[PDB]
Amino acid sequence: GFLRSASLGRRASFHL
Amino acid sequence: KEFLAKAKEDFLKKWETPSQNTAQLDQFDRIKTLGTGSFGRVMLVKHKESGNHYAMKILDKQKVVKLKQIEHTLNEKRILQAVNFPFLVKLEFSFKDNSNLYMVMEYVAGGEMFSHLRRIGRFSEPHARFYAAQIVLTFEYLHSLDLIYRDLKPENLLIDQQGYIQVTDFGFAKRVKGRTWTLCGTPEYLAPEIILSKGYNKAVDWWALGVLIYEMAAGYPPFFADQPIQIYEKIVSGKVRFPSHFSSDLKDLLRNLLQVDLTKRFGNLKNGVNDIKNHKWFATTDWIAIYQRKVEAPFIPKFGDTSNFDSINEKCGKEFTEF
Ligand SMILES: Nc1ncnc2c1ncn2[C@@H]1O[C@H](COP(=O)(O)OP(=O)(O)NP(=O)(O)O)[C@@H](O)[C@H]1O
Numbered sequence: 597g598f599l600r601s602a603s604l605g606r607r608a609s610f611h612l
Numbered sequence: 613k614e615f616l617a618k619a620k621e622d623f624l625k626k627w628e629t630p631s632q633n634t635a636q637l638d639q640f641d642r643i644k645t646l647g648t649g650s651f652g653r654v655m656l657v658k659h660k661e662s663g664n665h666y667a668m669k670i671l672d673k674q675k676v677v678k679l680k681q682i683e684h685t686l687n688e689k690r691i692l693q694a695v696n697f698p699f700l701v702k703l704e705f706s707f708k709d710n711s712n713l714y715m716v717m718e719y720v721a722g723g724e725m726f727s728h729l730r731r732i733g734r735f736s737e738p739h740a741r742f743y744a745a746q747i748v749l750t751f752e753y754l755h756s757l758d759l760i761y762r763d764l765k766p767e768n769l770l771i772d773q774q775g776y777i778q779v780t781d782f783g784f785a786k787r788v789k790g791r792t793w794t795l796c797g798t799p800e801y802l803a804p805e806i807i808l809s810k811g812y813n814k815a816v817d818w819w820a821l822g823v824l825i826y827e828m829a830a831g832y833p834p835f836f837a838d839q840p841i842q843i844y845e846k847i848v849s850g851k852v853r854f855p856s857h858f859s860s861d862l863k864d865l866l867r868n869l870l871q872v873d874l875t876k877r878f879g880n881l882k883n884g885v886n887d888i889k890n891h892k893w894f895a896t897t898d899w900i901a902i903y904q905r906k907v908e909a910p911f912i913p914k915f916g917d918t919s920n921f922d923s924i925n926e927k928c929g930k931e932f933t934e935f
């Protein structure tokens with residue numbers, strides 16, 4: 597139940 | 613459907629003849645770069661003539677062949693040079709070299725919406741409605757052309773110096789009339805039908821829209837956890853907790869957009885796009901004025917200033933003959 601800064605940083609796109 | 617049939621005809625005509633070699637690298641002069649990726653570099657260049665500032669991508673043929681990403685790099689250019697919409701970044705010049713690709717597109721100064729959103733914290737629901745309405749029209753335009761976007765996120769929404777949206781990334785784009793199966797996107801924006809390995813159609817973008825609106829008004833995405841595997845469980849569970857400051861109209865629109873049932877989700881029903889355009893949340897939205905871009909923007913960035921951002925032998929050339 598936290599708002600961690602890693603979940604608020606920029607997000608990259610993956611491809612598989 | 614006058615604008616609908618005009619767009620499809622001019623698109624399918626431009627789609628069959630994808631222009632190329634319409635400019636020279638030497639014509640533009642090198643200016644400060646904007647960003648880089650695993651496949652290439654994204655730069656801002658200036659044309660010696662009246663063209664002046666332009667955003668250009670330089671991709672290496674080695675990179676797209678190495679990880680089999682070549683499938684998405686051919687779709688990207690062809691879709692860009694054939695579309696013509698206000699909220700889509702205009703592709704202006706396209707040409708190839710012995711070792712690099714060149715997609716000269718418009719430079720967008722205001723920067724990624726992800727930056728402004730994180731600074732402010734949250735966007736007011738009016739501020740969110742202005743940005744969301746442009747995406748709805750952008751999806752209706754791309755869905756009438758049978759195209760799916762598959763990468764909606766604040767990091768891919770650029771603000772122009774007039775405060776409007778310019779959607780940039782078209783890597784994971786592709787046109788499908790039925791369904792597809794490729795796993796692409798961002799975990800916090802993936803639709804349930806993508807995670808379950810079931811087929812997915814154009815309805816994944818209307819899911820991503822519900823996430824994008826949620827993140828604008830709340831300040832954080834609806835599904836998040838320490839591990840990505842928990843995010844997938846949250847996405848497929850169908851349980852979304854809305855913030856207190858959400859309006860009744862917004863919470864109602866999101867439950868229909870973030871619907872796990874693929875056939876009870878807005879933008880996929882019989883009415884189609886007007887399901888969302890005629891919602892109680894979009895009552896204040898004049899869609900004709902949004903398309904014509906004659907609406908006072910709720911936020912215009914501070915403003916070519918880059919202030920908001922932070923062998924010669926031919927190799928694999930025939931693999932990009934279409935380009
Ligand atoms: N037309 C443009 N105008 C201004 N900045 C742009 C433009 N196109 C891309 N950028 C920026 O260039 C960088 C590259 O982002 P992007 O266009 O998504 O390519 P990418 O390979 O996905 N790199 P990344 O977004 O970091 O994963 C980002 O910082 C964008 O904001």
Ligand SMILES: [Mg+2]
Nearest residue numbers: 607608609781
């Ligand atoms: Mg990316």
Ligand SMILES: [Mg+2]
Nearest residue numbers: 609767768781
């Ligand atoms: Mg991006």
